Design a protein around this ligand. Structure first.
Ligand SMILES: Nc1ncnc2c1ncn2[C@@H]1O[C@H](COP(=O)(O)OP(=O)(O)OC[C@H]2O[C@@H](O)[C@H](O)[C@@H]2O)[C@@H](O)[C@H]1O
Ligand SMILES: [Cl-]
Ligand SMILES: [Zn+2]
Lengths: 291, 8
């Protein structure tokens, strides 16, 4: 988990402000919005990166372009690339990062309102974050469903096929015969109802806090290039302080910056280390990491 | 509700 700063520039002062805000608003909570950047330190291979075995396996299987692996039409025409990706990225193959544990720490301190994640690694949940506080915007491998009729299936049959050599005779629905796949949201598919429903509730929650425990929304490791998830930042109340911890300034933080926006160019794990330091929760955090 | 998963 060892981390280092992205550059010679120190982000400790910027992180100090966050800790200061939380110290001034002790009964406040934080909403996190996270992306693939928070799992990079976990060693998860990026399917879009030529340096990975996953990318080359997909290329050899004749996948047209990386994101076609998450395309419904392509999947129906050829499920092998996706099965191949699922074998390598199946939840449980990796371990949570220091940042994932930070979410658990905030939960323990009761300062976590919600974590909206567009990742499908389920690492927030694996790290101990409670189901009620997690919004897996793009689904997960916890359930499987028929892409045709929607019949639900336990995730085990699909997972069992990933261990066969070679992978063939893909899982089909016992009702309509169409392909069954993990409950992951593919491009072109709608997100689970809980996404919009919970954001509707947390949006009112945010606004009501403004008029008095001022909240904080921290966006971490996401390029904000996938909608509707990417619409969340701009929908945050102007009177609610936004924080962006990302190697680059992206999305609404770039297009329409706000006076109170706090941008922190830092690795998520280093950010976690620094924030825990400024909050003085090193002891409790150390316990979690060693647990 | 936002629509289907997509870019842009
Ligand atoms: N250790 C890190 N700490 C902070 N930010 C990081 C880190 N590593 C990467 N980042 C930043 O996190 C962002 C990650 O962007 P993406 O890789 O595009 O991922 P994400 O936005 O979450 O998108 C997922 C994408 O993966 C596919 O599921 C789907 O194709 C989709 O386009 C980038 O803006 C990058 O600068
Ligand atoms: Cl509350
Ligand atoms: Zn079916």
């Amino acid at each position: 988990m060892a981390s280092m700063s992205v550059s010679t520039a120190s982000t400790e002062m910027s992180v100090r402000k966050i800790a200061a805000h939380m110290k001034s608003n002790p009964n406040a909570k934080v909403i996190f919005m996270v992306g693939a950047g928070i799992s990079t330190s976990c060693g998860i291979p990026d399917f879009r990166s030529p340096g990975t075995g996953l990318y080359h396996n997909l290329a050899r299987l004749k996948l047209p372009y990386p994101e076609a692996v998450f395309d419904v039409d392509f999947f129906q025409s050829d499920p092998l690339p996706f099965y191949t990706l699922a074998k390598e990225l199946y939840p449980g193959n990796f371990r949570p990062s220091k940042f994932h544990y930070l979410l658990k720490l905030f939960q323990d301190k009761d300062v976590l309102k919600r974590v909206y994640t567009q990742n499908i690694d389920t690492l927030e949940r694996q790290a101990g974050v409670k189901d009620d506080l997690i919004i897996e915007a793009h689904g997960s491998f916890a359930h499987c469903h028929c892409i045709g009729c929607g019949k639900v299936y336990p995730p085990q049959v699909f997972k069992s096929k990933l261990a066969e050599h070679p992978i063939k005779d893909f899982v089909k629905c016992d009702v309509c015969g169409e392909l069954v796949k993990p409950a992951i949201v593919f491009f072109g598919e709608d997100l689970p109802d809980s996404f919009s429903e919970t954001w509707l509730n947390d949006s009112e929650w945010l606004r009501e806090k403004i008029t008095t425990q001022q909240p904080l929304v921290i966006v971490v490791g996401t390029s904000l290039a996938v909608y509707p998830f990417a619409s969340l930042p701009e929908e945050i109340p102007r009177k609610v302080k936004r924080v962006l911890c990302n190697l680059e300034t992206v999305g609404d933080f770039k297009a329409n910056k706000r006076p109170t926006d706090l941008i922190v160019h830092q690795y998520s794990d280093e950010f976690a280390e620094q924030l825990v330091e400024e909050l003085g929760w090193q002891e409790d955090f150390e316990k979690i990491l060693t647990a | 509700k936002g629509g289907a998963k997509r870019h842009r």
